[PDB]
DNA sequence: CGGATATCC
DNA sequence: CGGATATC
């Protein structure tokens, strides 16, 4: 796919937001504007994007096999490059010209691990990641580990998390 | 099968 | 000076 302007790119996720569903038990089931969340260079407001992200929020760990794998788009031509459960790349159809289009899910309890994660840039998370290596912890999008336990940290949001790992937060157009 | 090889932030 | 995913 092609670059985008960053217009471009939340053109084409306005777009989606009303448009996007699956395929399951002979239902099109609707995924809400509610549970999708733009993320990547996106999110990081970059004036031009490699792609789109967008992290959708499954409500609900058993239709995790069914949403990614039956995903519909109305009103669009697109094909799948990959797709499984949680990362499916598409190529879309836009204005004459194709663009790549990748989806992630998370589900609940992991939405502030998973924006973290999704947000990036990818510098700022080895660095972030390398720091709490050090230390004898694991962080990736789906929570903080220790000795191979999951830390239950009290959060809600992507802030608070980076406030209780202890670093600066930074609004996402200004991590590097 | 999955270890090997494309991929994502 | 990280960590996880998809395909076969
Ligand atoms: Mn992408």
Same mark, same amino acid.
């Given at each position: 796919?092609?670059?985008?302007?960053?217009?471009?790119?939340?053109?084409?996720?306005?777009?989606?937001?009303?448009?996007?569903?699956?395929?399951?038990?002979?239902?099109?089931?609707?995924?809400?504007?509610?549970?999708?969340?733009?993320?990547?260079?996106?999110?990081?407001?970059?004036?031009?994007?490699?792609?789109?992200?967008?992290?959708?929020?499954?409500?609900?760990?058993?239709?995790?096999?069914?949403?990614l794998?039956?995903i519909?788009?109305?009103?669009?031509?697109?094909?799948?490059?990959?797709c499984?459960?949680?990362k499916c790349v598409l190529? $879309?159809?836009? %204005? =004459?010209?194709?663009?790549?289009?990748?989806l !992630? *899910?998370?589900?609940?309890?992991? +939405?502030?691990?998973?924006?973290?994660?999704?947000?990036?840039?990818?510098?700022?998370?080895?660095?972030?990641?390398?720091?709490?290596?050090?230390?004898?912890?694991?962080?990736?999008?789906?929570?903080?580990?220790?000795?191979?336990?999951?830390?239950?940290?009290? $959060?809600?949001? %992507? =802030?608070?998390?980076?406030?209780?790992?202890? !670093? *600066?937060?930074?609004?996402?157009? +200004?991590?590097?």
């Open positions: 796919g092609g670059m985008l302007t960053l217009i471009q790119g939340k053109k084409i996720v306005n777009h989606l937001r009303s448009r996007l569903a699956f395929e399951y038990n002979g239902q099109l089931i609707k995924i809400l504007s509610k549970n999708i969340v733009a993320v990547g260079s996106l999110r990081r407001e970059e004036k031009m994007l490699n792609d789109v992200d967008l992290l959708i929020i499954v409500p609900e760990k058993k239709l995790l096999k069914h949403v794998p039956n519909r788009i109305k009103g669009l031509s697109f094909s799948v490059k990959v499984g459960e949680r190529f $879309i159809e836009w %204005e =004459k010209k194709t663009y790549q289009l990748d !992630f *899910t998370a589900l609940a309890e992991e +939405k502030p691990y998973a924006i973290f994660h999704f947000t990036g840039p990818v510098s700022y998370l080895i660095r972030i990641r390398a720091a709490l290596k050090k230390k004898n912890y694991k962080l990736n999008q789906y929570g903080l580990f220790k000795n191979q336990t999951l830390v239950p940290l009290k $959060i809600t949001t %992507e =802030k608070e998390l980076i406030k209780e790992l202890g !670093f *600066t937060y930074r609004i996402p157009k +200004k991590r590097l």
